Amino acid sequence: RDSFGDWAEKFLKSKEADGVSVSQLNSYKNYCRNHLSPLYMKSLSEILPADIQSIINETKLAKNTLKAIRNTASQIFRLAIENRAIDFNPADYVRIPKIALEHHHHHH
């Protein structure tokens, strides 16, 4: 009975009350709204570890951004674990792909 959107909104409000910068707070909101959008409408029990990994596959941005998305999710799941809504953190099972060749591709 615990939707990711529920806990995400609480996490957002939590950090807003914690005293983070508005731009920073809006960053969290953007992560859960845009990237974790499919998850936001799902329940914690309906969220798959490989499903989050799929979001990382579809999100094609810089390393820092990819990890930031996952880190944000991890913190949200941790909050859920605090209330014991979910029993584990699938986001911490998500690994950030390091597809990196020393030789340049098309973009020099």
Torsion of CA 63, 92, 53, 35, to 10 degrees: -70
3-state secondary structure of 43: strand
Torsion of CA 63, 76, 95, 28, to 10 degrees: -10
Provide the experimental method for this PDB entry: NMR
* Contact (CB, 8 A) for 10 and 88: no
Residue 38 placed within a domain: yes
Residues 6+ apart with CB under 8 A from 84: none
Residue 105 placed within a domain: no
Residue 102 placed within a domain: no
Residue 19 placed within a domain: yes
Taking residue 53's Cβ as centre, other Cβ atoms within 10 Å add up to 17
Work out the burial of residue 89: count CB atoms within 10 Å of its CB; fewer than 13 is exposed, 13-18 middle, 19 or more buried. middle
Q: Domain range holding 38?
A: 1-93
Q: Cα-flanking dihedrals φ and ψ of residue 3, to 5°?
A: -80, 145
Total count of domains within the chain: 1
Distances from the Cα of 67 to the Cαs of 2, 15, 30, 61, in angstroms?
24, 18, 14, 10
